[PDB]
Design a protein around this ligand. Structure first.
Ligand SMILES: *[C@@H](/C=C/CC(=O)CCC(=O)O)C/C=C\C/C=C\C/C=C\C/C=C\CC
Length: 257
């Protein structure tokens, strides 16, 4: 039934809104130019220095540790969104964990897109905007830790997806039956079918002229996994050249792999 699938979509979009403070709708309103939502822009050290005057150790390390604590917040939000996914809580508690462990970052970078444009990314809930050039000018080896993200975004953002489409897509990602260490794959794969079903209808109804967007979008999951692995490697270098740099526990458990 179309109606059954449309219902599940409605249900998801709804949980999505309740779980994420900064939707793409808002993110775009702020980047577009739609006077009371205008961000302070950080493009150099001095602006950075001035940012803390109104926006919410070392400069590169202070920024990196900023992303850390921020993703830890993202994990808590996605984890809450997961629970609302019909069937996810009924799954084995161990696989409930495994899925989150492998789906967390893929999702963070998908939604991180909503906050970017070719020349920069929104920070602190949209209060600010840090340019892509500044981050790139970060002392090695922190200079290129956002570069491959920006490339993903410009490509992904090109699909023109809105919040309702994403809610189902990040749902499809979490319920991936091909995760390392899954005990019961069958139950997980049946939920995803439903999700893929929902998504497929969603895109067709929401993007009538965008041919094979369903397939186009699904292919992006390759770019996402690509990005994660590149990150893990970088992280390995960091921990060696920066033995005096700590990592948030939650973020370390997820990385043990
Ligand atoms: C940087 C986030 C990068 C995500 C990442 O790869 C690290 C995650 C991990 O597990 O290692 C920030 C991206 C967007 C900014 C959004 C909000 C502001 C948070 C940090 C930005 C720096 C200072 C602002 C407080």
């Amino acid at each position: 039934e179309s109606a059954d699938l449309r219902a599940l979509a409605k249900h998801l979009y709804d949980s999505y809104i309740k779980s994420f403070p900064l939707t793409k709708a808002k993110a775009r309103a702020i980047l577009t130019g739609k006077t009371d939502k205008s961000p302070f822009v950080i493009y150099d050290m001095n602006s950075l220095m001035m940012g803390e005057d109104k926006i919410k150790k070392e400069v590169a390390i202070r920024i990196f540790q900023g992303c850390q604590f921020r993703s830890v917040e993202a994990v808590q939000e996605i984890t809450e969104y997961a629970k609302s996914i019909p069937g996810f809580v009924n799954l084995d508690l161990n696989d409930q964990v495994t899925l989150l462990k492998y789906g967390v970052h893929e999702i963070i970078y998908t939604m991180l897109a909503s906050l970017m444009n070719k020349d920069g990314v929104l920070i602190s809930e949209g209060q600010g905007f840090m340019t892509r050039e500044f981050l790139k000018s970060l002392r090695k080896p922190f200079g290129d830790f956002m570069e491959p993200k920006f490339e993903f975004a410009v490509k992904f953002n090109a699909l023109e997806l809105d919040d309702s489409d994403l809610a189902i897509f990040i749902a499809v990602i979490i319920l991936s039956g091909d995760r390392p260490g899954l005990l019961n794959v069958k139950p997980i794969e049946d939920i995803q079918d439903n999700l893929l079903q929902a998504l497929e209808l969603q895109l067709k109804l929401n993007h009538p002229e965008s041919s094979q967007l369903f397939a186009k979008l699904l292919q992006k999951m390759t770019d996402l996994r690509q990005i994660v692995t590149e990150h893990v490697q970088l992280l390995q270098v960091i921990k060696k050249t920066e033995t005096d740099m700590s990592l948030h526990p939650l973020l370390q458990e997820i990385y043990k792999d």
